[PDB]
């Protein structure tokens, strides 16, 4: 199925040769292909592994047989041209949706209001707004109604009343 792969190439090396060897490593996927030729540019490893003070970052997004990415996890991680093969799919805690996209107006609103950049408004980033209307769209309702009204007798004033005039 859908597969995004974050690549960790070995040590410090040229960008293009690493791109080519990462393509060769993606070839280890039997049919998980349709890659878009792109990369994340240069990003160094924040800590030396034992002599690797830096590396290069590449992203490969494509789709294919889900069973046939385990062999990639073997080959990329074993062969000394990829160190980490990070895979994205549903087994990792998922939340994606192809129809929840119409919520990026909230994205613009939060980018505006993650920190209030105007002197007039300096509200905390964790304070309410309250245009509230309380939409539900999920109730599990049943429309029970009365059709036969027998024995007219109801209980509405069920609060006690006692102890009349006392001397």
């Amino acid at each position: 199925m859908q597969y995004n792969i974050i690549l960790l190439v070995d040590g410090s090396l040229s960008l293009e040769q690493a791109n080519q060897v990462n393509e060769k490593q993606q070839q280890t996927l039997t049919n998980v292909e349709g890659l878009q030729t792109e990369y994340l540019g240069l990003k160094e490893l924040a800590y030396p592994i034992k002599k690797q003070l830096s590396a290069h970052y590449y992203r490969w997004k494509f789709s294919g047989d889900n069973q046939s990415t385990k062999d990639f996890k073997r080959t990329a991680n074993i062969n000394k041209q990829v160190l980490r093969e990070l895979i994205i799919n549903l087994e990792r805690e998922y939340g994606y949706l192809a129809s929840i996209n119409p919520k990026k107006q909230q994205l613009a609103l939060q980018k505006r209001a993650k920190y209030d950049e105007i002197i007039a408004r300096e509200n905390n980033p964790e304070n309410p707004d309250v245009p509230v209307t309380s939409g539900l769209a999920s109730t599990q309702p049943r429309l029970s109604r009365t059709e036969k009204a027998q024995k007219p007798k109801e209980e509405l004033w069920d609060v006690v009343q006692k102890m009349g005039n006392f001397d």
């Binding site: 960790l8 924040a46 939340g95 929840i100």
Partner: protein
Amino acid sequence: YCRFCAIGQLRIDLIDDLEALKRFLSPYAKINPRRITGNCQMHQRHVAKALKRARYLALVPFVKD
């Protein structure tokens, strides 16, 4: 706290969101609990798994520098 809970996506993944990671991660390369990060509970596990991957990914060190 995370922008993801403020937009609506119900999941995150390591798309090099390191900036917000630095808000959740102390300069000591250790993951602060849910209190500091500010996620509710779901984006909390999302950023937890992302930080653990970054540890594996060498995006963030375990402790070694």
